Amino acid sequence: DKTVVIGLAADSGCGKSTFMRRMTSIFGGVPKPPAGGNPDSNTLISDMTTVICLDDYHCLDRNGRKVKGVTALAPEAQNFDLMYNQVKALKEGKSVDKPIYNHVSGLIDAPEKIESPPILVIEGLHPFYDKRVAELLDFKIYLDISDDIKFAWKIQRDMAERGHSLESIKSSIAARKPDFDAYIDPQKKDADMIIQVLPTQLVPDDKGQYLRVRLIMKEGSKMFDPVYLFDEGSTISWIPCGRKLTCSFPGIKMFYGPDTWYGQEVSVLEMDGQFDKLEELIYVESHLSNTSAKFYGEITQQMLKNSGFPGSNNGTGLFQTIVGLKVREVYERIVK
Amino acid sequence: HMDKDKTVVIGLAADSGCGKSTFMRRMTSIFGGVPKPPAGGNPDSNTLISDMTTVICLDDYHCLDRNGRKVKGVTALAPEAQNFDLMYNQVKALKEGKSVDKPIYNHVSGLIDAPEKIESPPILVIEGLHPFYDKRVAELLDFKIYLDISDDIKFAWKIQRDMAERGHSLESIKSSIAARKPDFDAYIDPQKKDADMIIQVLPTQLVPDDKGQYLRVRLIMKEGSKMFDPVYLFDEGSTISWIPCGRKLTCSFPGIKMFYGPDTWYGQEVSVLEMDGQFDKLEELIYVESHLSNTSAKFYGEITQQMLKNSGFPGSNNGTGLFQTIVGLKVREVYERIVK
Numbered sequence: 001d002k003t004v005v006i007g008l009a010a011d012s013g014c015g016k017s018t019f020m021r022r023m024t025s026i027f028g029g030v031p032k033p034p035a036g037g038n039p040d041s042n043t044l045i046s047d048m049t050t051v052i053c054l055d056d057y058h059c060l061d062r063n064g065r066k067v068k069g070v071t072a073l074a075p076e077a078q079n080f081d082l083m084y085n086q087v088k089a090l091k092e093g094k095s096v097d098k099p100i101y102n103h104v105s106g107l108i109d110a111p112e113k114i115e116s117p118p119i120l121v122i123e124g125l126h127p128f129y130d131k132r133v134a135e136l137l138d139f140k141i142y143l144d145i146s147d148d149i150k151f152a153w154k155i156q157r158d159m160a161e162r163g164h165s166l167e168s169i170k171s172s173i174a175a176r177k178p179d180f181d182a183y184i185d186p187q188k189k190d191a192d193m194i195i196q197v198l199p200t201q202l203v204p205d206d207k208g209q210y211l212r213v214r215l216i217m218k219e220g221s222k223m224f225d226p227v228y229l230f231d232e233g234s235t236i237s238w239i240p241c242g243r244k245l246t247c248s249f250p251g252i253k254m255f256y257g258p259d260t261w262y263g264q265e266v267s268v269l270e271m272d273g274q275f276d277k278l279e280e281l282i283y284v285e286s287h288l289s290n291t292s293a294k295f296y297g298e299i300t301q302q303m304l305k306n307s308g309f310p311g312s313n314n315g316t317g318l319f320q321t322i323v324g325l326k327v328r329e330v331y332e333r334i335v336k
Numbered sequence: 337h338m339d340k341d342k343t344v345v346i347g348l349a350a351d352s353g354c355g356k357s358t359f360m361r362r363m364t365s366i367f368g369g370v371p372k373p374p375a376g377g378n379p380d381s382n383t384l385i386s387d388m389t390t391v392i393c394l395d396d397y398h399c400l401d402r403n404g405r406k407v408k409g410v411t412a413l414a415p416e417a418q419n420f421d422l423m424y425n426q427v428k429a430l431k432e433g434k435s436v437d438k439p440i441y442n443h444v445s446g447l448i449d450a451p452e453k454i455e456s457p458p459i460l461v462i463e464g465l466h467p468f469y470d471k472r473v474a475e476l477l478d479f480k481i482y483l484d485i486s487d488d489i490k491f492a493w494k495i496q497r498d499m500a501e502r503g504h505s506l507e508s509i510k511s512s513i514a515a516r517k518p519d520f521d522a523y524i525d526p527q528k529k530d531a532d533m534i535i536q537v538l539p540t541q542l543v544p545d546d547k548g549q550y551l552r553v554r555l556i557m558k559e560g561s562k563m564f565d566p567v568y569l570f571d572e573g574s575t576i577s578w579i580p581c582g583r584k585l586t587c588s589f590p591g592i593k594m595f596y597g598p599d600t601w602y603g604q605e606v607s608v609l610e611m612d613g614q615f616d617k618l619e620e621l622i623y624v625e626s627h628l629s630n631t632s633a634k635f636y637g638e639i640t641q642q643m644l645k646n647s648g649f650p651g652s653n654n655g656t657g658l659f660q661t662i663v664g665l666k667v668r669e670v671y672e673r674i675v676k
Binding site: 237239243287 | 570571573574575576577578579580581583584597627
């Protein structure tokens with residue numbers, strides 16, 4: 001009894017559904033859309049978790065947004081009143097009839113009723129934008145992909161740049177970017193945990209194949225404690241190479257230490273590079289402390305359990321796994 | 337009951353004016369009891385004997401005295417001025433168990449004096465400029481240590497202890513460094529290529545310092561020896577930079593910075609432990625020692641308590657005292673592995 005509410009702020013086409021899956025996979029069972037409902041539903045339900053895509057609170061459909069000269073990232077194209085009221089209702093056990101934004105058609109279909117679940121996760125562009133809705137959340141997570149990695153991935157995820165031609169878009173970026181930097185990006189300032197994806201510093205990479213990944217964690221919350229190694233509060237650089245874990249061409253380099261995040265006190269855990277044999281992160285894991293793992297090789301076990309996922313060989317999957325375990329910690333800390 | 341324990345030979349290569357004494361006192365203090373000159377004998381004798389340790393200063397094997405070398409156009413650093421045949425024989429003659437009549441290079445008189453009898457100790461320590469120069473001597477030693485002070489720090493130390501305040505002399509006279517440097521580069525400094533452990537003392541990288549007051553200190557440990565195992569930090573065989581928390585190790589500026597990692601020492605494979613900077617409260621070094629492994633300590637505060645015992649020594653607040661202490665515990669472990 002009593003429902004826990006997690007917020008995940010992330011962009012489209014930069015790995016939020018993989019992130020989502022890792023976090024739900026810790027409570028076991030893969031969330032799936034309603035059984036008979038809309039085939040284009042954005043919701044996913046499992047025994048323990050229920051994930052809601054915040055697009056369903058667009059107050060204007062695709063064409064309604066087009067005539068007003070507004071993008072999907074604009075606050076005025078969101079219905080925060082309804083989003084607040086409905087998130088609150090699900091928290092207080094009450095069920096909710098919630099619209100569906102049909103990404104295929106571009107129209108706002110009809111609900112879709114939602115039962116209040118053990119953990120409700122809301123994911124999208126504006127989980128922390130509305131102060132009423134933010135105060136509703138027990139844990140705030142932001143996935144920050146830098147523009148260089150974002151805009152390398154799309155010039156490829158777009159179909160090996162099969163369209164539109166050469167490049168030339170590149171200006172699908174220009175349409176979304178200004179709203180992104182004004183409305184979506186500032187939300188990472190009050191996140192409790194941030195995963196930041198940067199270009200590697202080990203080797204030259206025009207493809208975003210090799211990533212520098214930073215897990216930034218707020219100090220001083222009763223809901224969670226930051227992970228560290230090998231000594232909390234210190235500043236460490238750590239090359240694990242070369243026995244213990246195989247590292248091929250671009251090596252591995254860990255960093256750990258205190259930093260400051262928009263005036264706020266944070267500890268940072270960082271990885272640059274790529275594992276090549278996906279055991280041996282237990283090597284890494286055994287030196288990580290405060291991971292909120294319940295048994296010895298849990299991080300390695302979950303990452304094993306999700307092997308085919310993207311980002312399973314670099315810092316993305318690892319730090320997303322750790323943050324999943326912190327989500328369970330927040331729930332257990334709260335329901336007993 | 338009958339016998340008998342046979343001798344362990346440690347060699348230390350060090351220039352003078354670099355804290356060879358402090359290094360020696362830290363190393364003999366592990367075994368207990370301050371060594372002392374032989375009561376009774378030559379007033380200028382260079383030996384120091386303890387129940388556990390006997391320390392021979394290899395100047396006592398100078399095959400030409402002070403006006404020798406003058407006549408021959410060489411310095412005390414040259415291989416021409418040493419009698420490596422005597423050195424081999426008496427060192428051979430103290431390890432297997434005999435006693436020797438060893439000359440006394442009187443250091444004030446400049447002359448080699450009448451020998452003093454030296455008996456086979458539990459631990460023999462030969463110390464000075466040429467402990468590893470001759471190959472027969474070096475294979476007689478069970479552990480080889482080299483103290484490597486870089487030119488800049490030597491420079492900056494002699495500039496203090498002499499001239500530029502502190503001492504008496506001129507700035508110009510302080511290029512007797514100009515002499516002597518050709519011999520040190522040529523005959524002394526290469527002996528560190530073969531050492532088992534090397535303590536290198538370099539300029540700091542944390543703060544500008546022209547006086548040699550703040551030190552970057554390196555303990556370079558040869559890999560793969562039956563006689564000892566290198567120290568390590570957090571995780572053996574990795575590469576690590578570590579700035580301790582500063583709430584847990586109180587430091588004014590510049591602070592402190594550790595480094596641990598594999599490296600290459602003259603084409604040989606070594607483990608390197610580094611400390612840069614200075615710590616202000618010696619008791620908190622237990623925070624550092626808490627993350628070292630294979631220190632050859634017996635209980636757990638031993639390095640910290642060994643240093644607190646000798647807390648008035650030079651180097652007690654930087655990497656010099658720390659790593660010198662650790663080498664002493666590794667000399668103890670060499671001796672224990674042999675006699676068992």
